[PDB]
Amino acid sequence: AVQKVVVHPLVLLSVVDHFNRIGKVGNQKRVVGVLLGSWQKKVLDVSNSFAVPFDEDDKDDSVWFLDHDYLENMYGMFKKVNARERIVGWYHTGPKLHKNDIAINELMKRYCPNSVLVIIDVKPKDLGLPTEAYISVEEVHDDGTPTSKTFEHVTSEIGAEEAEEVGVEHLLRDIKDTTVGTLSQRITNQVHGLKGLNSKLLDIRSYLEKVATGKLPINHQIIYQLQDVFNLLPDVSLQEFVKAFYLKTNDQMVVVYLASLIRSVVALHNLINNKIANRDAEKKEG
Amino acid sequence: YLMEGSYNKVFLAKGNIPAESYTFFIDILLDTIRDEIAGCIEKAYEKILFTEATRILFFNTPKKMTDYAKKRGWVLGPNNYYSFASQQQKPEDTTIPSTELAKQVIEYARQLEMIV
Amino acid sequence: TRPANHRQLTFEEIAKSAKITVNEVELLVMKALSVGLVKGSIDEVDKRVHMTWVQPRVLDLQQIKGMKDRLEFWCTDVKSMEMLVEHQAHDILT
C-alpha cells in the first residue's frame, strides 16, 4: 500500500485547536474529522484538516453519527480555495483506537477509496511520536471471527513545508539543538532510542501478563513473532565476531587519532597566530 | 639471583656465608623459594616424573613433595603429573569491554564539545 | 529443544532421533531446507548441521511464561545501559 504518511504541522495544530474548541465537557470524549492532502510515488502527505461533527454514546459502541452533507458541503469550500488537496483519510484523537473505528473507515471509503486514519493525541506527555497512521487491510480467517477486517500500520513522521517551517520555528524560539554535532546525536538518537526500546519492550511485557491472568486466549500470531524476535537476537559475542568488531572499532580509532592530531596542530598554530599579535602590539606600544 | 631465575647459585651461596651460619634467615628464604619454584612449574607444561623434582634442590628421596603435592595440585596418577593452564575461556569477550569502551568514547565526546 | 547457543546438530545425533542411517541424513536436511521450514548450512567434514531458524510453533501456557523471563532479563539490561549513558553524558544532553 503506502510506505509512509507525512503529517504537516498545520494539521497537527488544527487537531489540538479542535479538541479545545469543543472539549468543554472536560471528562472525556474523542474528536473525529476529515483529513486532506496529496501523495506522490506512494508516499502520502497530509496538509489540511477540517472538523466533521461526530457524537457517540459510550455504552454499546455501535452507534455514531458523521455528517455526510457537512463533509460534502465543506469539501466544496476547500476545493475552491485549493484544488490540489483532495480527501485522503480521517483523523481522531482516540488514544486507544476505539473498536467502532473499523466501520467508520467504510463510511469514508467512499470519498477516498484507500483512506488512512491518523491518531494524534491532543494531550501528549510522553517520548514517542504522537501520530500513528493506520490503513485498512482485509483478510478473513477461521480463528478470530467470520468477519475479519483489521488495520495495518504505516510509518508516520512529521513533515515540513517551506512556508510552515518559517512559522513553526518562529513559534518555538524556545529550545533548539544548536551546534548539531556529537552533542545532538548522543541525545537525539542514542539516549532517546534506548528510552523507546525500553518502553516498547515494557509494552511486550505488559501483554505477557496474560500468562497468569488470561485476558485473551493466547493470540497465537503474537507468540509467533516473539519467537522470531528471540532467534534474531545477535549471536553471542564470543566467536570470530569479537575479532571482527575489534578490527573495525579500532580501525575507526585511527581516523579519530589522525583527526585529533590535525586538530591540535591547527589549534597550536592558532594560538601562535594570536600570541604573536599581542606581543607585536605590546612591543610597539612599549 | 632471586631477581632472575638463577637459583642453583642460591643454594651454592647458602653454604657460603660471610658472618656465621645465618640459618635464622636461610629458613625464611626456603618459604620464598619453594613457593616460587612451584608457581613457575605450574604453567601449561606436560608430565614431570617424581624423579627430577625429587633430587633437584637438596633432597634425595624425602616425603616433603608428597606433602608438597598435597597442599599444591599435581593430581596423582600413573606416575603422571599434569599442569594444565588454558586462560582461554575467560578471554575473547567484549560485553564487559562494551561498558568500559562506552565510557571511554563518551569522554572523548565530553571533552570535545563542552567548554572546560 | 536445543538452546540457540549450541545448535550444532551432528549427523549421528540426527539419524538416531529419526531412524535413518548416517549415509542418508543429508537428503533429509536438504528436504527440510528446500520446503523452507528450517534454515541453516551443512558441513560434511566434521559431520555437523547448523540450524539458524526453526519455524515458530505454538506454546501453550508455560513456554510463554518463560518468554516473560527472557524479557525481564532483557528489559533490565537495556535499562542499565540507558542510565549509564545518561549519567556519564550529563554535560552532553538537553
Q: Resolution limit in angstroms? A: 2.9
Chain B residue at shortest CA distance from C87: B103
Any B CB within 8 A of C89 CB: yes
Q: Write the Ramachandran bin of B62: left for phi over 0, alpha for psi from -120 to 50, otherwise beta.
A: beta
**Are the C-beta atoms of A247 and C76 separated by less than 8 Å?**
no
Grid coordinates of A131: 501520530
Q: What angle do CA A170, A175, A178 make, to 5 degrees?
A: 100
**Contact check, Cβ <8 Å, B109/A182:** yes
- CA quadruple C62, C64, C65, C70: dihedral sign: positive
Residues forming a β-bridge with A89: A35, A116
What is the distance in angstroms between the Cα of A75 and the nearest Cα belonging to chain B? Answer: 52
H helices, E strands: number in chain C:
3, 2
**Contact check, Cβ <8 Å, B101/A182:** no
Residue C5 is nearest to which of A220, A231, A236, comparing CB atoms? A236
Element (H, E) at B101: helix B95-113
Domain boundary assignment for chain A: 2-182, 223-282
Q: How many CB atoms lie within 10 A of CB A278?
A: 9
Question: How were these coordinates obtained?
Answer: cryo-EM
- List of chain C residues whose C-beta atoms are within 8 Å of the C-beta of residue B109: 89, 92
Any A CB within 8 A of B2 CB: no
**Alpha carbon of B4 to those of B7, B8, B9, B43, B57: distances in Å?**
8, 11, 11, 18, 17
**Contact check, Cβ <8 Å, A182/B113:** yes
Give burial (CB, 10 Å; 0-12/13-18/19+) of B7: middle
Residue C88 is nearest to which of B103, B113, B114, comparing CB atoms? B103
Instruction: For chain A, list the strands marked E by DSSP.
Output: 4-7, 32-40, 43-51, 54-55, 65-66, 86-92, 116-119, 132-138, 149-158
Grid coordinates of A257: 587519532
3-state secondary structure of B47: coil
Look at residues A132, A147, A111, A139 and name the one whose alpha carbon lies nearest to residue A37. A111
Q: Which chains touch B (3 or more CB pairs under 8 A)?
A: A, C
Grid coordinates of B107: 569522554
**Contact check, Cβ <8 Å, B102/C85:** yes
Which residues, at least 6 apart from C17, have a Cβ–Cβ distance to it below 8 Å? none
**Are the C-beta atoms of A201 and C74 separated by less than 8 Å?**
yes
Residue B94 is nearest to which of A183, A186, A245, comparing CB atoms? A245
**Contact check, Cβ <8 Å, A238/B93:** yes
**Are the C-beta atoms of C84 and B99 separated by less than 8 Å?**
yes
Any A CB within 8 A of B31 CB: no
Count residue pairs from B and C with Cβ separation < 8 A.
22
